[PDB]
Symmetry: C3
């Protein structure tokens, strides 16, 4: 009569890496890294994005004639923009604090256009000026949301205009200053030399003077237009005054909604979907702590790591080979009912089994360790990504270094944690079998002999009741002791 102690084997081919060994085959393993996406630009939480197309943010806000589909935009989840958009400032020039405006737009999620300075209030000036650089069907035209003020007859009176913010929320207002190319242009347009543009609010006070100089021709013109912006608080007034060279606004943008959005640089087009995490390469759907798709993401994206594989072992070391022997020379292939167990062979018959308590304890411990690895990762809405001008390179380098350093730290953490946990799991699984063997030996004592392969041979003829007794942990030594002596 024999009883053996051993573990379970199967036909798995998964491998994990420990700190002491490489490419160790295991019976059960879990991949905790997702590497797949659907390659589609999709709607986030049921709200479609704002597809700018070939239009920049400045072109959309200023009302470029080639972005006329954006004159009334609904609520959006994020903004899709191209790397080098073609339809921006049709009239050459510059935009002050452009990156700050984009950062502000990264948390807006909806706008409302309000007419604040109607084009017909300027009864002493000409408000029908246009340039060929913003042409529409071969005729001169200008930005849709702005007004160009020009002399009426041969006079340019002082132009004054004010607006009191009764809309109900904060407002964004954009104005501009025109820089001519020569004195003749200035005289033709405004009749005066030495002009100014003054803008004033409760917390803003700005005065500007045009610069007249010859410049290289961009879009055919040597002139430039410089645009500025401000945020008007509730129940506040904005004042305008100019003796020339003022591109006054006609509309203001009220911030209706507010939340978590972003500007993502892609060249794609929207297609029907419904997602939660969006990447400039596609959409994601998983539950694992890490991925390796793209650093700059938007949504419920778990964590970006610079690693190609992260597999956690939750099963046995797969040694296939097994007068059935025990755990000295490998596991068993026919015991598909659990992790650890016993094998008995008496006159009635042979058969496998499983130790329920030890298997359940190991299962609970392994599951708790896996859930501790996965569950302790703090996740928040991080629409990372910022833009800097060409006069701010130290800031850009600082941001890049910060992101790369954090990425390296988390990659190192993931790798070392996975390796160390794999080694402890594989050691603990063998310690459990050793403890089972030790407990059986201690509760059996001298009525049995050891064959050295993990099995015990019985001096006393053991029936299935005795097998259940030893497996159950209730063995009465002073019953067969007298009988076991005689045959020993």
């Amino acid at each position: 009569d024999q009883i053996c102690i051993g573990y379970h084997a199967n036909n798995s081919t998964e491998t994990v890496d420990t700190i002491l060994e490489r490419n160790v085959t295991v019976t059960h393993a879990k991949d905790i890294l997702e590497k797949t996406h659907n390659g589609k630009l999709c709607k986030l939480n049921g709200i479609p994005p704002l597809e700018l197309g070939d239009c920049s943010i400045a072109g959309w806000l200023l009302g470029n004639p080639e972005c006329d589909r954006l004159l009334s935009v609904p609520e959006w989840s994020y903004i899709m923009e191209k790397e080098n958009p073609r339809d921006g400032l049709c009239y050459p020039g510059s935009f002050n604090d452009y990156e700050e405006l984009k950062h502000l737009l990264s948390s807006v999620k909806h706008f409302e256009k309000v007419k604040i300075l109607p084009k017909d209030r300027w009864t002493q000036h000409t408000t029908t000026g246009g340039s060929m650089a913003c042409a529409v069907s071969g005729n001169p035209s200008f930005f849709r949301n702005m007004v160009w003020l020009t002399k009426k007859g041969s006079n340019y009176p002082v132009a004054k205009g004010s607006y009191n913010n009764t809309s109900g929320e904060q407002m964004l207002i954009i104005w501009g200053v025109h820089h001519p190319n020569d004195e003749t242009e200035q005289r033709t347009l405004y009749q005066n030399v030495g002009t100014y543009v003054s803008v004033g609010t409760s917390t803003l006070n700005k005065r500007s003077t045009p610069d007249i100089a010859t410049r290289p021709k961009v879009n055919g013109l040597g002139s430039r237009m410089e645009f500025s912006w401000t945020l008007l608080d509730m129940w506040d007034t904005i004042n305008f005054e100019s003796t020339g060279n003022l591109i006054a606004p006609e509309y203001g943008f009220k911030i209706s909604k507010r939340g978590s959005s972003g500007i993502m640089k892609t060249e794609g087009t929207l297609e029907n979907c419904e997602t939660k995490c969006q990447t400039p390469l596609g959409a994601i759907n998983t539950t694992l702590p890490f991925h390796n798709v793209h650093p700059l993401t938007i949504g419920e994206c778990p964590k970006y790591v610079k690693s190609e594989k992260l597999v956690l072992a939750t099963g046995l070391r797969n040694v296939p080979q097994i007068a059935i022997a025990g755990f000295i020379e490998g596991g068993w292939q026919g015991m598909v009912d659990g992790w650890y167990g016993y094998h008995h062979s008496n006159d009635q018959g042979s058969g496998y089994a499983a130790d329920k308590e030890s298997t359940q304890k190991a299962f609970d411990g392994i599951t708790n360790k896996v859930n501790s690895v996965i569950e302790k990762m703090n996740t928040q809405f991080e629409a990372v990504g910022k833009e800097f001008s060409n006069l701010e390179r130290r800031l850009e380098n600082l941001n890049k270094k910060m992101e790369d350093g954090f990425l390296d730290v988390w990659t190192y953490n993931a790798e070392l944690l996975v390796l160390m946990e794999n080694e402890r799991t594989l050691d603990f699984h063998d310690s459990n079998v050793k403890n089972l063997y030790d407990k059986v030996r201690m509760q059996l004592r001298d009525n049995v002999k050891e064959l050295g392969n993990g099995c015990f041979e019985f001096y006393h003829k053991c029936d299935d009741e005795c097998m259940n007794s030893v497996k159950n942990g209730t063995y009465d030594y002073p019953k067969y002791e007298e009988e076991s002596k005689l045959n020993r």
Copy 2:
């Protein structure tokens, strides 16, 4: 006669968490996280703070008439400032590079005030200007550290003034420029149109021109005052020149004491206690390495972590179940001297005893582990807190991201380290008791029988000396060899 080996149990209810199990009761534990404070603001290292009250930094430095209690301030340890102070710039305007000034103030103490340009030197101008914005007792007044120069009679000559820094340290100087509301006011005050203000040092060169424009009324006025500041090096000269619109300084601030300080944003007052660490919610008096009261802190203080429980296990599991059995069926409450020990039952009596060597070894190891975890964290004077303007949102976001990332990293590190160390300790203890059992078994050999519960049964008569020898490592096996053979 019997000897048994087992561990020690008590009535503790403390609970620790491991990477494999939750809610595990232990005999001893150590808390390394501070979660309490005083609720009070008081002195740091014997030096009281500077309580601004309803005053701002600019209001204190410029001499707001409502802040006259701060005309002479002794040495301070830190500055207490409200979130939205009421008494700042009584005359509406702006302050250039305000946040840089606050950052400089985060490392300065005392600020001895010296008179650089006496008010009576301006013999060719009028120095008694005032406004109803800064009104005392119903009469017009002005800032106490500045001079408002106006026309004497009907003339405003060129105003010139210089100072040489022969004080002994760096000096902070503030000057302003007036922006009127209309040309009539400019003519009434300064009699000229087309004025300028020029300030120059060996490293500075600034020229300003007034701006005349209608503006929304703040504090009843449509005019503004713009202030700028500079740091004057030792043995350096500052030159002033103005045809009009100059607010000259009368006093300069000398940096007397330099050190580690900060600005605390609180709405509370100062009470009479003393501490070596201060948080906006209260003071921390502790020696523990961590705390979770508040991120922003001033003084030498423990690190901050976003956790609610950090407990180190320093003792065995509390399994209280107890012919007395051994370690296999749980611990003993009869052991009141050590962690691992013995129990003997001879014919002269019985009782409990402790093994001093193993207990001392395990105690030293656990103390080393605790001190290694605690002492491998470096803390210094960390003044978390900085101010940013409206047009610096990207920098504020960068600062917030950096702080949050580092705090998250350290919280993760502390939690995982505590979990792993707790699991290691719980395995250390049972390894130690098993080692003691195996040592005694090897020393005793075939003179005894193993009962399967951690107890031995002797084949001879173990008196007090015999049992003491077993407890000492000096068991003389050959003495009782032949005797034990007969009984077997």
Copy 3:
């Protein structure tokens, strides 16, 4: 006959550290921290650095007459600059966006000077101006790369000049503006009052006006010169227009070679040596994953840490004390050909031995462990170092805190890794010894007699062949069953 199981010992003094113990003497160790340099400034990958001597970047680019040895420089790997260079701006003044220019130079490895505006083209002005501040041999002189335009006769016509970038790469152009002291100087030099300097490209539009004011004398002059720089893209035109106070450029710097570089702040001199990693104190020659020489490296260098000692244990603990005993009493000094082995004393002499499979497995495990710890850290060209102005203190503090936090995190990670792995390996060796002893005991069974010191005493007479069979896992129990049963 008698066979014992033990481990190897020697006369090593090296001590490693664990989390439970300190100063543990081990047989073999491995230091993964580098602490030595050569105290020399050397050539990086065979390319010598650019030695500025006592000059600054501004003095070299502007053409300081005291920096005439740098009028034509070859390729370089990095730039060596003093903390406080003596020869910078000989004429007192400032330099707009100086730190940005230095950061740009941190990624440029060569320049090619191109003559864009020849000095003889100004046929309507005088181009022979100089000052005694930039004096050569007692005569007035000026910057070598700049032209000082001055009235010819009694006239200063409008000065116009343009350049089209057909060189083949981006070009760096520097111009300047002169600020006189009094009006008499302005009339003497330029004949006009109310002048302007206009500079314009496709993306740049700048206009400046001279400031005339009395200022403290620096280098004997109250006048100043303000310098600005720009980057001209390929096939782009720059325009200069001025009615006075223009310091025109004569040369343009074309970016010939690009790469990863930096600026080293040192007071030393280049020596005749090569290197691959360079620190301000000296070069580093190592193949290790850590160092503590200097953080401001330039090149492919190991990671910096504030650790003073990082030693991994690769061998066994040193317990040097041993008829012959086994592994309980201590280590063996005689055994030299392995880690775990035997000792046999039969009738044909005596001697030690060394198990092969166990030593091979342990050696492979430790090798994989050290390789995993070392080859997990990413090292690339990370030449660090940035400059900030006196009005950018918040940015400087931000950068410093970022670097300090990252380095503290990495130091913690390295220390924890080494401290935990040392415990793991020191327990691994003991487990291996015990497993070998248990395997021998299990395959020997009842024919032997354990003595409690790690040694098995035989019953039947066993020759060298039988012991060799025992050591090779082929001992036949049935062969000696009859003889063993008799003596037992």
